[PDB]
Amino acid sequence: SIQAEEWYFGKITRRESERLLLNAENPRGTFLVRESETTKGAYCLSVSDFDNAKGLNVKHYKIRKLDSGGFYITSRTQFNSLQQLVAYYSKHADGLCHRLTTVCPT
Numbered sequence: 244s245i246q247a248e249e250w251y252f253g254k255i256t257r258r259e260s261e262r263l264l265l266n267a268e269n270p271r272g273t274f275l276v277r278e279s280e281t282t283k284g285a286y287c288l289s290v291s292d293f294d295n296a297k298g299l300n301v302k303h304y305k306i307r308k309l310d311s312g313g314f315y316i317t318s319r320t321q322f323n324s325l326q327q328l329v330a331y332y333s334k335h336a337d338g339l340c341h342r343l344t345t346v347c348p349t
């Protein structure tokens with residue numbers, strides 16, 4: 244159950260996710276998964292980043308869940324569960340701003 248996942252922040256807003264991620268103590272890849280504010284049944288993976296151009300910043304990726312069962316950010320790379328998707332992106336940056344590292348502090 245994703246509700247049981249410590250990285251699943253459920254119903255928190257985009258602004259709140261940014262308030263939490265925009266902490267100078269957060270290394271690149273600090274993340275959380277929350278419900279999308281506007282797309283029923285989709286989620287957002289909010290991730291912190293840092294570079295010398297933008298400084299500390301946050302990116303949000305839409306995670307889709309099909310009624311067919313799969314979870315994905317890009318349809319070409321799907322997962323059997325949100326947990327597997329999180330595990331995969333913690334090892335591969337692929338198209339993300341950074342690989343997922345640690346769960347965002349509350």
Ligand SMILES: *C(=O)c1cc(/C=C(\NC(C)=O)C(=O)N[C@H]2CCCCN(Cc3ccc(-c4ccccc4)cc3)C2=O)ccc1CC(=O)O
Nearest residue numbers: 257279280281286287302303304305306316317337338339
């Ligand atoms: C949550 O569902 C959510 C997410 C978004 C996402 C974006 N909109 C805004 C205003 O932030 C968005 O544009 N995100 C960027 C992120 C940075 C990368 C550029 N792209 C296109 C893209 C996305 C992902 C990948 C990729 C990822 C992993 C592997 C392979 C490829 C490539 C290219 C973005 O989408 C907007 C709204 C919401 C709903 C909410 O905030 O509540």
